Every structure is written in structure tokens, then in C-alpha cells.
Amino acid sequence: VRFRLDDTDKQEISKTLTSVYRSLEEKGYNPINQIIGYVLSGDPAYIPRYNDARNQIRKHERDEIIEELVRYYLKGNGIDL
Amino acid sequence: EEVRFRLDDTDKQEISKTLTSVYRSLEEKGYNPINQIIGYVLSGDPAYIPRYNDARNQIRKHERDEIIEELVRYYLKGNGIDL
């Protein structure tokens, strides 16, 4: 199963952040605080290695995550994007 | 169905009003609105926002980390990740 990952297209940001949030909770962290820390810093060290959470965040770029956060916020607050 | 109210200036500036107003001002003046907002969010520099239509004045009512905190909290709540 070493050669299984035959689709390296990025998955949905919502799927990544769901798994990262759950892993943060299991390890006893405040998940919202650690996710804010990653977005402020761009540093994956804010995310634990448990259950591949840090490797999952590394599949994305921070500026890509910020763009989705901004688009989601504006749409939910009344902007027709 | 929710109406936005124009409050007094002594009321705290709400981030939802700032960011939507900044977007509409950037768009009306011909900038790329998402791109300039990302520039602000990455840098903390109000100069990515034009002074036009009080856009820069509104972004200066907040700190970069306050805007990022609200963006994250709004996303996690809206997508059902936090509850």
C-alpha cells in the first residue's frame, strides 16, 4: 500500500481542517487557538503530528487557506462573489 | 433575513461591516478585491486597502490578528466543525 496515493490533487480545505480540529482535540489542545496560530504564522509546528494532522496541513499553502477563509466569510456576510 | 443597522461611531466597529464595505469599495474603484484583502491579511499593512470611501479608515479600526481570529472562527462554526 506504499504506492496507493495515485491522486495528489489537493482535497477540500474543509476536509483537512475537520481532521486537524479532531486531532487537536484528541491531543488535549484548544483546537481553535492552534488553528489561529497556524494561520497567523504559516508554521506547521502549531499542528501536532498525531493522526497525520501536520502532514495534512502541509498539503496546502497558508495563502490558499487564507483565500478560502476570506471568500467563505464574504459570501456568508452578503457578498455575491 | 437580517437588516444591517447604521450605529453611532461610539459603537465598536464590527468586522463584518468593515470587510464587506472594504470589498465593495475595492470593487467599485476597479481593484481586484479578494487579492488586495489577502495582501492585507498576510502583511498587516493597511496600504493594501485604498483610502477611497473610508475603506482604509475602517481596516485601521482592527488589528491583523483580530481579523484572522474572526475569519477562522466564522469558518469553523459555519462548516459545522466546532459543534
Residue numbers in the entry:
A (entry chain A): 8 to 88
B (entry chain B): 6 to 88
Text from the published report:
Thus, CcpS modulates the activity of phosphatase CpsB thereby altering CpsD phosphorylation, which in turn modulates the expression of the Wzx-Wzy pathway and thus CPS production.
To gain more insights into the phosphorylation events of CcpS, we further analyzed the X-ray crystal structure of CcpS-T4ET7E, which mimics the CcpS-P. Although we obtained a high-resolution X-ray crystal structure of CcpS-T4ET7E, we still could not resolve the N-terminal flexible region structure. Superimposition of CcpS onto CcpS-T4ET7E folded structure revealed that overall structure was highly similar to each other; however, we can observe that a resolvable structure of N-terminal partial region is significantly different between CcpS and its variant CcpS-T4ET7E (chain A, N-ter). Although the electron density map of the N-terminus was not clear, the partially folded structure of the N-terminus between CcpS and CcpS-T4ET7E chain A crystal structure was obviously different (chain A, N-ter). Notably, the ligand CcpS-T4ET7EN has a lower affinity to CpsB than ligand CcpSN. As expected, rCcpS-T4VT7V has a higher affinity to rCpsB and much more than rCcpS-T4ET7E at least tenfold. This result further supported that CcpS phosphorylation indeed modulated the affinity to CpsB. However, rCcpS-P or phospho-mimetic rCcpS-T4ET7E has no significant effect on the process of de-phosphorylation of rCpsD-P catalyzed by rCpsB. The most likely reason for this is that the glutamic acid substitution can not fully mimicked phosphorylation at Thr4 and Thr7 in vivo. Instead, CcpS-T4ET7E possessed properties of both the phosphorylated and non-phosphorylated forms in vivo.
